[PDB]
């Protein structure tokens, strides 16, 4: 194969410009391999299949392929949220893994907005004005004043439900309960409960949601949460699957939890990574795709690809050709 690029003498044509990236090189050929991989992934889902619920304790019809998705907290409050909502509203994914910061940020966005800002600003001055900093974004301190006024009754009712009727609470269930209360067609966790897509987040205590739990404890004590039940659900969601795929959009615990789930079934069959980490430190976040096959988390027949770029400038473009051109096919 030769190496060519867009001529640009034919006029601006967007269909060809994003299709000519596959023969440019460097990070462009990685993008082409990624789009080819994801396009190959969806084609298997549409094939018809022609009991299982009791074994997996889940209310959902098994499809030809189950797609796993995960994201890091800083991505949710970065404007990517519209793409995730589009991916979830119509069934296109089956498992979501996040961090407590993600749910904390996503819930408030339905109640109050977030404003832009600049990268270099001293925090000493910003603290007096009452402005917090998250990257290049700035959030007000007034925003956190309505969450405290809205979450306490839910926890009161949860404690009452635990004491009165038999129920044991798991992180996969507290998320679902919050969704029905928000009652809004623009929050991604509202559509999660409607179409029965479970959400997992083992590190739920750490975050601003933890702060609310601590204060409540010294007035109505007794709340209980268990993390051993979620493991069973996530593992049996992958053991009994015909074929699987992974789309990990950031490094951290989300990468470890998703990959380790597929270990019990001799790896996945298609995968793609998008993160900006490094490998010389040896951190799991920066591990190359070929490192996964050593542990037995990515089958030896697949061809994983990994793109080094910020998720903001790549993810919206990737969903433009793969998942949007076949909307009528669902």
């Amino acid at each position: 194969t030769q190496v060519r690029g867009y001529d640009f003498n034919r006029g601006v044509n967007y269909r060809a410009l994003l299709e000519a990236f596959g023969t440019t090189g460097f990070q462009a050929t990685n993008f082409g391999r990624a789009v080819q991989q994801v396009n190959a992934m969806i084609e298997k889902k549409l094939e018809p299949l022609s009991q299982h619920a009791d074994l997996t304790q889940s209310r959902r019809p098994l499809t030809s392929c189950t797609i796993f998705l995960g994201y890091t907290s800083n991505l949710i409050s970065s404007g990517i949220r519209e793409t995730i909502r589009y991916l979830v509203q119509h069934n296109m994914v089956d498992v979501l893994v996040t961090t407590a910061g993600g749910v904390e940020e996503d819930l408030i966005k339905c109640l109050a907005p977030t404003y832009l800002g600049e990268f270099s600003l001293r925090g000493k001055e910003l603290r007096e004005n009452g402005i917090n900093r998250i990257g290049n974004l700035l959030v007000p301190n007034e925003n956190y004043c309505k969450f405290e006024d809205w979450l306490m009754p839910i926890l009161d009712q949860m404690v009452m439900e635990q004491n009165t009727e038999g129920v044991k609470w798991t992180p996969s269930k507290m998320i679902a309960r919050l969704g029905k209360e928000i009652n809004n067609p623009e929050s991604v966790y509202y559509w999660a409960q409607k179409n029965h897509i479970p959400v997992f987040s083992p590190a739920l205590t750490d975050g601003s949601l933890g702060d609310m739990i601590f204060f409540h404890s010294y007035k109505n004590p007794g709340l209980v949460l268990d993390i051993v039940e979620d493991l069973r659900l996530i593992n049996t969601q992958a053991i009994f699957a015909k074929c699987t795929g992974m789309i990990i959009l950031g490094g951290g615990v989300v990468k470890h939890h998703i990959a380790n789930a597929n270990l019990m079934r001799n790896g996945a069959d298609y995968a793609v990574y998008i993160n900006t980490a490094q490998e010389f430190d040896g951190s799991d976040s920066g591990a190359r795709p070929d490192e996964a096959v050593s542990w037995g988390k990515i089958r030896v027949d697949a061809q994983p690809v990994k793109v080094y770029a910020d998720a903001s400038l790549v993810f919206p473009l990737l969903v433009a050709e793969t998942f949007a051109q076949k909307m009528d096919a669902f």
């Binding site: 053991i239 270990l263 019990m264 079934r265």
Partner: peptide
């Protein structure tokens, strides 16, 4: 390493 892992290797 795992019980399922050994089952998978043997079957493969």
């Amino acid at each position: 390493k795992h019980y399922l892992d050994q089952l998978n290797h043997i079957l493969g």
